[PDB]
Ligand binder design. Sequence first.
Ligand code: HEM
Ligand SMILES: [Ca+2]
Ligand SMILES: [Ca+2]
Length: 306
Amino acid sequence: MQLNATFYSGTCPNASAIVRSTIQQALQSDTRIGASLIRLHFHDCFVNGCDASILLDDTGSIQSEKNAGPNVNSARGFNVVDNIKTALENACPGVVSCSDVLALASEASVSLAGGPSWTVLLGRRDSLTANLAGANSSIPSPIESLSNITFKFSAVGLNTNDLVALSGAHTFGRARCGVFNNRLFNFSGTGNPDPTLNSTLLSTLQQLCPQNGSASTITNLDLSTPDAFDNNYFANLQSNDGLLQSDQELFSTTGSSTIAIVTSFASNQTLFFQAFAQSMINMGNISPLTGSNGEIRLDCKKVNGS
Ligand code: HEM
Ligand SMILES: [Ca+2]
Ligand SMILES: [Ca+2]
């Protein structure tokens, strides 16, 4: 059973519209929501495939993924996912799955943010279980080596091209102090700050994230255009303005093939969009539940019958 773009064509003709419409409203009170929703789709596909398992909440038997290191005090926008699901539920009762919902939301979010559009493949069914442990070992960390990070991407089915391109989703969105302050004062026990981090920026961050201050203070992943989906994320890397250690590693790791891909995207926005749109379909195609597998949740937070 293969995913396709006209799967809900006869049952929910305007699904793409409803999703877009809802998000564009949420974007009225939260410019950040665009980047938050796409990340959820990211975290969903890297664990047990794109099955919307990340949306399930804790119950006696379900150990919610929302608690894995990557998600706890980080993942957000679940309330909006429900608003999207509700709209879809009024217009199209029991039709659209939460898995497809996150896939559709990702496209709409990038789109409204000024980014590319792409034919979204639908037909995913919702899982009946979550995977907390797998979320802790399958999702890459910003302090992991470019090597370690590449590996985890191979494990789900994405290559180096998919890596650099999908890393551009950091062109907008936020990140807390705790996920990068390691580069601000004593980087890897050397007594000094990460040398691949621009000097001007470093200072601004040492103030934003003092050694004893809150680890949950946030800043923009892209100091250039915090909410616009453009190719600046890569321009930033060239100036050593990459926020996350994983970000800069894509460009400042001498002798890596990722360097040409980065300079390519920072040089031509069309290429980046094409590659990105491409790598987004690819990630959406990971281990999906189809046919008689999984179900179509009426409420994304729990399994039906619960
Ligand atoms: C290659 C490895 C990656 C690493 C190490 C990584 C790491 C992170 C971290 C640590 C944050 C900040 C979370 C926080 O501070 O609470 C973040 C935010 C974000 N990431 Fe990634 N990320 C990666 C790949 C991706 C991919 C593939 C996408 C999507 C296609 C993505 C989309 C986002 C977005 C849009 C945000 C902002 C979310 C928000 O502002 O709420 N990330 N990422
Ligand atoms: Ca998942
Ligand atoms: Ca941007």
